[PDB]
Write a protein that binds this ligand. Structure first.
Ligand SMILES: Nc1nc2c(ncn2[C@@H]2O[C@H](COP(=O)(O)OP(=O)(O)OP(O)(O)=S)[C@@H](O)[C@H]2O)c(=O)[nH]1
Ligand SMILES: [Mg+2]
Lengths: 179, 360
């Protein structure tokens, strides 16, 4: 009977809220509501240990920078996220989110999460990327970002298809349980 | 005793069981209205008029006790006489729905709730004053003993006679309900009583509401005398500094009660919080004082403006909820407040969300 706290951060509309709702409610919300501040709970079992998981959802938008530090205080593991369909989204990993996290949550383990795996092989997505001379994200550099930012590990998922979502929260829990 | 025992066994001769049981309930309404009017006239004659004549207290203090007794009496007199006017055309009373609307619907409804409100609003405060006035003055205690021993009161004290209006307004809905129980369903009559019944509950709510509001205004007055906002003059927190000379009296109270404040890890503080129209003020108690302080971990402001907060539920704790202060000019903050029970948490949440919406 152990409690752990997780905070999810990443750019606006990169799939932070949806990933929590799918995991906690097991349904995907269809209307987009930009998060200001939201609180969720979920239960999971990992390696024969029972864990309550508080999900702290944060705002990716700039206007709410000032509210975000209020979710950081007692964090056991951070889910740092980016979208695979947004390539500007990963350059914000080392330029905004890592600095922010390491400042408010030092030595607290970080999981790097790639969101919207379903949109890799979606034709409608790749065509709009070309207009900015850009292409979707592969798993090698994801791995690299993670090695570069001293992340605990690395994960790809899809909230729409439900693919690999629980696999995310297992590592997050192992991270919190470890040390 | 019964309606059946009055009128005659000759007169009930040709009537169904439903019609009789219906007459029994209607009669109860008529008879108890006659009692209530008389109770009001006892108040008038034995208390109000004697106090007026004999100058037992100042005029404004007496007007507070019985603000509009003559007018209240006029209401139940005109209604009672219309009942009696109905009885004139035979002991079997027929269509009665038109009578009930004439008192609980439209203008009538407006008239009744205004007067009853004004008569009951301050009453609990006035009665307490009367109780204290009796310990203060020999001369007043003598009068109260004289008046309560009067035959017309039939061994009842002031407190019992005066509360009768509320008792009466709280009885109207149950009394209609029984009439509706014994009315032919799907007639014009049936629907109209339902309409009358519904408005009785509205009037009930309206009057209880005004009592609730007046009692709140009076509680704030009290709280203002015990308020120590001294620490707010030393400022430092720009939001707290606004409320160095607060004054609760200028606002209405929505809700109040004890919440434990989770200021930190293994640091708690018991508060008594007030929900007002525009503000949430967090109050700490010494003895009889109500403190406004800042409280350290950079400090928290004891007063939050509702037009600059967010309300959220703690998902791991169904007792606790967050208030997030989003006021500019200072760093934003998380107030984690714990309620007594889960049901109490829901009551706070509900009233909080409503007040924030109306503020914004
Ligand atoms: N194709 C696809 N779309 C997704 C996925 N996850 C979320 N979305 C869509 O992207 C939009 C934003 O997702 P959301 O989770 O609300 O972003 P957010 O990170 O919470 O955005 P914010 O709260 O920081 S402003 C929504 O319209 C949703 O439909 C996904 O896995 N695949
Ligand atoms: Mg979000």
């Amino acid at each position: 009977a152990i409690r752990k706290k997780l905070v999810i951060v990443g750019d606006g509309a990169c799939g932070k809220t949806c990933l929590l709702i799918v995991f906690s409610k097991d349904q995907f919300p269809e209307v987009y509501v930009p998060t200001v501040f939201e609180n969720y709970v979920a239960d999971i079992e990992v390696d024969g240990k029972q864990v309550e998981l508080a999900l702290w959802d944060t705002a990716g938008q700039e206007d709410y920078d000032r509210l975000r530090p209020l979710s950081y205080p007692d964090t056991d593991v951070i889910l740092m996220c980016f979208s695979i369909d947004s390539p500007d989204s990963l350059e914000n990993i080392p330029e905004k989110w890592t600095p922010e996290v390491k400042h408010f949550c030092p030595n607290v383990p970080i999981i790097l999460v790639g969101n919207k795996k379903d949109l890799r092989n979606d034709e409608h997505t790749r065509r709009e990327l070309a207009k900015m001379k850009q292409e979707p994200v592969k798993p090698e550099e994801g791995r690299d970002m993670a090695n570069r930012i001293g992340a605990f590990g690395y994960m790809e998922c899809s909230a729409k298809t439900k693919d690999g979502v629980r696999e995310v929260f297992e590592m997050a829990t192992r991270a919190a349980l470890q040390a | 005793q019964n309606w059946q025992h009055t009128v005659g066994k000759d007169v009930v001769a040709g009537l169904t069981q439903r019609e009789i049981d219906r007459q029994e309930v209607i009669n109860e309404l008529f008879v108890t209205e006659a009692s209530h009017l008389r109770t009001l006239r006892v108040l008038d004659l034995i208390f109000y008029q004697r106090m007026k004549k004999e100058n037992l207290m100042p005029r404004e203090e007496l007007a507070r006790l019985f603000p509009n007794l003559p007018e209240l009496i006029e209401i139940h007199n005109s209604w009672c006489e219309a009942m009696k006017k109905l009885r004139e055309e035979g002991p079997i009373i027929k269509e009665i729905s038109d009578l009930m609307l004439a008192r609980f619907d439209g203008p009538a409804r407006e008239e009744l709730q205004q007067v009853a409100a004004q008569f009951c609003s301050y009453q609990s405060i006035a009665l307490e004053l009367i109780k204290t006035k009796q310990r203060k003055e020999s001369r007043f205690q003598l009068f109260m003993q004289e008046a309560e021993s009067h035959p017309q009161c039939r061994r009842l004290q002031l407190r019992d006679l005066i509360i009768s209006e509320m008792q009466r307004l709280t009885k109207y809905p149950l009394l209609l309900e029984s009439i509706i129980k014994h009315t032919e369903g799907g007639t014009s009559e049936h629907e109209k009583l339902c309409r009358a019944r519904d408005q009785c509950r509205e009037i009930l709510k309206y009057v209880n509401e005004a009592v609730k509001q007046t009692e709140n205004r009076h509680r704030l007055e009290g709280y203002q005398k015990r308020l120590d906002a001294t620490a707010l003059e030393r400022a430092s927190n720009p939001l707290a500094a606004e409320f160095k000379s607060l004054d609760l009296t200028t606002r209405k109270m929505i809700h109040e009660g004890p919440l434990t404040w989770r200021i930190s890890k293994d640091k708690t503080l018991d508060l008594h919080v007030l929900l007002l129209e525009d503000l949430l003020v967090l109050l700490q108690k010494q003895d009889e004082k109500l403190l406004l302080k800042c409280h350290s971990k950079q400090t928290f402001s004891p007063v939050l403006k509702l037009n600059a907060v967010l309300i959220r539920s703690v998902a791991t704790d169904k007792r606790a909820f967050f208030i997030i202060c989003t006021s500019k000019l200072g760093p934003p903050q998380i107030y984690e407040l714990v309620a007594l029970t889960s049901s109490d948490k829901n009551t706070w949440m509900e009233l909080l969300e409503e007040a924030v919406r109306n503020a914004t």
